[PDB]
Every structure is written in C-alpha cells, then in structure tokens.
Amino acid sequence: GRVTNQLQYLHKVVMKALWKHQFAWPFRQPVDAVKLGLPDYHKIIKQPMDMGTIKRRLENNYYWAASECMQDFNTMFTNCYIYNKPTDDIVLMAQTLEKIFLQKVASMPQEEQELVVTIPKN
C-alpha cells in the first residue's frame, strides 16, 4: 500500500478518536461467533470487519487509498445494524461511533495525494 494525506488522517485522527471511545470495545477485535454462540453470524455477515483489523492495516500501510479504509469502517458499522436487533444498545453504540466517523471524514483533506516527494533520477 502507500501513505496518503487522507490515509494518514484516517490513522492518526479518525482511528485515534474512535479507538479510545467509551463504546469502542466491542469493535476492537473481530466478532468471535464461536465463543458468543452466534453460528448464524457468518451466514448473515459476508464481510466481517473490526477496528483492530483496520488499525493493523493502517499501521502496516495495507491500504492504497482512503476509500478502502473508509469502506472497512462503513462495513463494520453496517454489519452491526444488519445482524443485531433494532433495540440493542450495541446498535446505538455503533451509531454513536459512526456519527463521529462521519464528522471526522468531513474534516479530512479534500483531495487525496500520496505523501511523496521524489528527486528525478534516471
């Protein structure tokens, strides 16, 4: 992957804010559907995603574009709304985190640029 202004902002502003939120802990690691007794979880949710995975990907420069990172966040939230019950607090926790995510994306640099300056050689 690579480092862009938007990806660096996602890592050290957006993820920084979301990871330490009071509601973050259910989303810091993948759903353990075996331990939690949810053997329909992976039947219903085709793309599991969590902030621990996203954070590791940001740390390892896995993403090529901010859009891929934003789609992982988006999928994480949507998974929660699709699987759980409308009245579960976990849904309201996801909704709270997603509102912060959106507000941070609003303030992200507008145009993605790779963080690179090269001296012409050859």
Ligand X SMILES: COc1cc(C(=O)NC2CCN(C)CC2)ccc1Nc1ncc2c(n1)N(C1CCCC1)CC(F)(F)C(=O)N2C
Window contacting ligand X (CB under 6 A); options: 2-10, 79-87, 95-103, 111-119: 79-87
Listing DSSP states for 56-116 in one string gives HHHHTT--SSHHHHHHHHHHHHHHHHHHS-TT-HHHHHHHHHHHHHHHHHHTS-SS--BS-
**Using the rule CB under 6 A, which residue among 7, 31, 51, 58 binds ligand X?**
31
Q: Which segment (9-17, 61-69, 83-91, 112-120) binds ligand X by CB under 6 A?
A: 83-91
Cβ atoms of 112 and 66 closer than 8 Å: yes
Answer yes or no whether residue 90 interacts with ligand X by CB under 6 A.
yes
Verify binding: residue 97, ligand X, rule CB under 6 A. Answer: no
Contact between 43 and ligand X per CB under 6 A: no
